[PDB]
Design a protein around this nucleic acid. Structure first.
Ligand SMILES: [Zn+2]
Length: 273
DNA sequence: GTAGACCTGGAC
DNA sequence: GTCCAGTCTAC
């Protein structure tokens, strides 16, 4: 999940948990718990706290409780669902928060890549993993200037730059490839090779793409769905991600796939320069 | 920067 | 069987 997907989860999950009080926290895969590292302390401290809010920072969910904030990263396949504690758990459920009303928040993650950190609210933003995050792309904090500042300072590919959460927070493999196509820039190009014009265009398309994806409920290309199990619809508006071999929607040239920054990379060799 | 790590299951 | 799908870490 990237910003659009996490934001959709945030919006759909909040009403299902706000105001509920945690009675127990059960952990079936301890490695997901990163702080405190002792899963027993992680579970103990949340008992008795009430969910007061749910925010998003980059690709992270921030559950606001009473004294603490639970920072959750879904990584590649993490997902949340709210259900009855009387029903059997679904496969690959690794963390469960039991509420006093008999309902529970279940975290499933087939690949076990997700992470959870709990800190006092006032400490969450100045500690990892949130501390080093770049600006929110849909905020004034993210501007062409902010992008250029990091671009004209590194030689790595522009794709690697956009995937760097310290540069700007929220973009993943899908939206980086899509934004670059829309801006007409090849993913393997050195970030420092982009002109002021290209930087402005890239910023514009990044904001437009991420904004459009949020409105469409994110992209469901594998298994991502909102809290209600409803798939997003942005996958129908993809120009290059996962379309290798298919004709470009703008010029008809076959989309190509290669490896850039160690990630599958999709692009149109004609529309992108 | 770039293979290797961490894991698990779905296409080829 | 072999290939493929986000962040921390090592030759
Ligand atoms: Zn094209």
């Amino acid at each position: 999940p990237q910003l659009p997907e996490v934001e959709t989860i945030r919006r759909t999950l909040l009403p299902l948990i706000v105001g509920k009080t945690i009675e127990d926290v059960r952990i079936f895969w301890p490695n997901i718990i990163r702080h405190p590292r002792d899963s027993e302390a992680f579970a103990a401290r949340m008992i008795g706290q009430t969910v007061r809010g749910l925010e998003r920072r980059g690709k992270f969910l921030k559950f606001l409780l009473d004294r603490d904030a639970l920072i959750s990263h879904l990584r590649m396949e993490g997902r949340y669902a709210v259900a009855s504690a009387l029903e059997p758990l679904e496969p690959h459920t690794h963390v469960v928060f039991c509420f006093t009303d008999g309902s529970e928040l279940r975290y499933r993650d087939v690949r076990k890549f997700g992470t959870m950190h709990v800190y006092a609210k006032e400490e969450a933003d100045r500690r990892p993993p949130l501390a080093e995050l770049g600006p929110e792309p849909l905020s004034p904090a993210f501007s062409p200037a902010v992008l250029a500042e990091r671009a004209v300072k590194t030689k790595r590919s522009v794709k690697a730059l956009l995937l760097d959460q310290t540069v700007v927070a929220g973009f993943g493999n899908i939206y980086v490839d899509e934004s670059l196509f829309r801006a007409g820039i090849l993913p393997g190009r050195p970030a420092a090779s982009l002109s002021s014009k290209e930087i402005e265009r890239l910023h514009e398309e990044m904001v437009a793409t991420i904004g459009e994806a949020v409105m469409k409920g994110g992209s469901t290309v594998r298994t991502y769905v909102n809290t209600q199990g409803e798939a997003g619809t942005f996958q129908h508006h993809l120009y290059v991600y996962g379309r290798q071999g298919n004709p470009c929607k703008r010029c008809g040239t076959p989309i190509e796939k290669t490896v850039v920054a160690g990630r599958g990379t999709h692009y149109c060799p004609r529309c992108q320069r």
